[PDB]
Structures are given as C-alpha cells and as structure tokens.
Design a protein around this ligand. Sequence first.
Ligand SMILES: C[S@@+](CC[C@H](N)C(=O)[O-])C[C@H]1O[C@@H](n2cnc3c(N)ncnc32)[C@H](O)[C@@H]1O
Lengths: 111, 210
Amino acid sequence: MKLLTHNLLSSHGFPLRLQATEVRICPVEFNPNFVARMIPKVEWSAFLEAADNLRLIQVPKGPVEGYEENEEFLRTMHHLLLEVEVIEGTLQCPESGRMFPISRGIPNMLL
Amino acid sequence: KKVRLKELESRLQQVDGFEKPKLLLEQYPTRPHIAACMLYTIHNTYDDIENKVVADLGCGCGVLSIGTAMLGAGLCVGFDIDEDALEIFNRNAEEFELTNIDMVQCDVCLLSNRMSKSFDTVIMNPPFGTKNNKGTDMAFLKTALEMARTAVYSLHKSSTREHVQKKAAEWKIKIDIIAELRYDLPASYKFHKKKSVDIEVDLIRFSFHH
Ligand SMILES: C[S@@+](CC[C@H](N)C(=O)[O-])C[C@H]1O[C@@H](n2cnc3c(N)ncnc32)[C@H](O)[C@@H]1O
C-alpha cells in the first residue's frame, strides 16, 4: 500500500490511522507532471501522520511556493507518495477503533 | 513510446486469470480483445489514462488494471471482494513489473464516501447479478460516479440500455455509447447461449456537466 492510496482511502473529519510492521522501498519512474497535479489533491494531515508512523524523515509540511517548478520537492513527494509501500500493517477506523489488516501490500476493508 | 491495439492485446494475453473462480461473484475476465479495444479508446480517443489516478471496480485478476498501468496511469487502484482474485492480480503486477498499481479488498456496494471524487477515471466490467431488485452493475455505477471526477467507463447489457440512459437523466450526468460489444463467457462455463453470443454488452462513457 502506497501513501497516495492511504490518502485516497482516508479523504473526504478523521483519517484512517496507519500502522506498519513491514515497509519496503519500490522504485517508480519519476513523472513530475503527475506529482505536481497530485499536490493540490493531497489531504496533508492524513499524509503527515501516516509518514510519521512509518518513521519517515524530512516530510514537507505542505506545498512549497511554486512547487510545480521545484524538482527536489516533486522528487521528495514522488518518493513519499509512491515509493514507500506498507507490506504488513493495519488501517484503523478512528470512530469505531476497528482494525483492517494490510497483508502483502493489500488492505482488507471488508467486514 | 505509444502502444497500438494489437500490441496491447498481445500483452494482455499474458495476464493470468481465475484459478478456482467463484460462480456467485461472476468471476469471468475481460477478454484481451475486449479489454485492449476498451483501454485503447479511453487513452487515444478521450485521454483518460495517462498521468491519471484510475479506479478499477471489481478488478478481478487485473486485466483492466494491468493495461491501464501499461498506458501510463500515475496510479491504478483495483478494488475486489475476493482475496484469491487479488492474490493472482498482485502476482501479475509483480511479473509484468508494473510499479504504478495498488489493490484493496472490499465490497464496492458497501463503499464509504471516503473515496468521493478521489479518482480521475473509473473503469469496470462489473457483475450483472440482481441483489434486492437492483442489478450489481448499477450499484457499482452509482459508486463509480461518486468516485470519478472526470469519467466512468463501464460495460452494461445492451438489452437493458433504456434503464441505464433513464438513470443517467435522473442522475443528471452525461452518457455516451462508445461501442456495442459481443463476447461469449469462458468455454469452461457450463451454461452458454445456443441461439446467440452469451454477452451483448455496451461500452459506455459517463461524464459530468461543466
Ligand atoms: C466480471 S468480473 C471482472 C473481471 C475483471 N475485470 C478481469 O478482467 O479479470 C467481476 C468481478 O467483480 C468481483 N466482485 C463481485 N462482487 C463484488 C463486490 N460486491 N465488490 C467488489 N468486487 C466484487 C468479482 O470477484 C469479480 O472479480
């Protein structure tokens, strides 16, 4: 499960709480045009807490001024949103406290 | 770097299908000729795959998701109720070496407004089965429209075209019959039609008002 997927699953308010026991790095080809069009769509609180839980460092606090032209910000965001895959972990429903397992990178949202 | 219909169809023929399919879940894959034509049209005619976040509802073993990823989607997310189906899809995603794919196990009929207008495009070959007087393809279609920001591409029976169009007018969304497809279910299937092709389906493009 990628952090962009976590973000789509949590969007709309309280986001799904991510926890992981196995996280791996998966190279994805850097597409700056896609990353830049995802930046205004990112729900940043959900993203920051998810990245914090996966023990990720130097996570941008929000979009930079003129991020469309800033490659380093787009590479950082590409990495954090697409290349950090949770393989084993859980997604927790905030209101009920229910845990949804993530196994082999696939979250199970089925009750 | 562009893919022609025949090349895409040949690559989709490498996608492994259902090992032990579940009859009640309508686990039949989109045939490479149907899937390639469908995906090629989405990208070349409407430009709804390349650098888009696509959702595949009832993704099964991944035929439509694997082809969408190969056509340049930023991310393709497949959704399916069956774990066994997603395990084959996960295997195909690893083997095709596709890095722009994700997967979720869930019931599309019981989906939360947590994914409202979260995708650019939604693609699907849905189940047609009746579930409390409503056909599953229509329950999937209302979910798809809630999720997609730009377009929904879906397969619905041609015989029931009147009901789909009636619901589009009611939902106040744009509708477009792209093609009329005629495919048979896998030869393995026990109850095939003898006077016609098994499935007479319409490839439909649903869009929104500006
Ligand atoms: C017609 S098949 C689609 C096959 C898939 N598109 C492919 O090309 O391999 C329908 C799929 O919907 C799935 N399905 C059935 N009911 C579902 C539901 N309630 N929610 C999600 N997926 C469901 C089945 O498991 C099956 O994989």
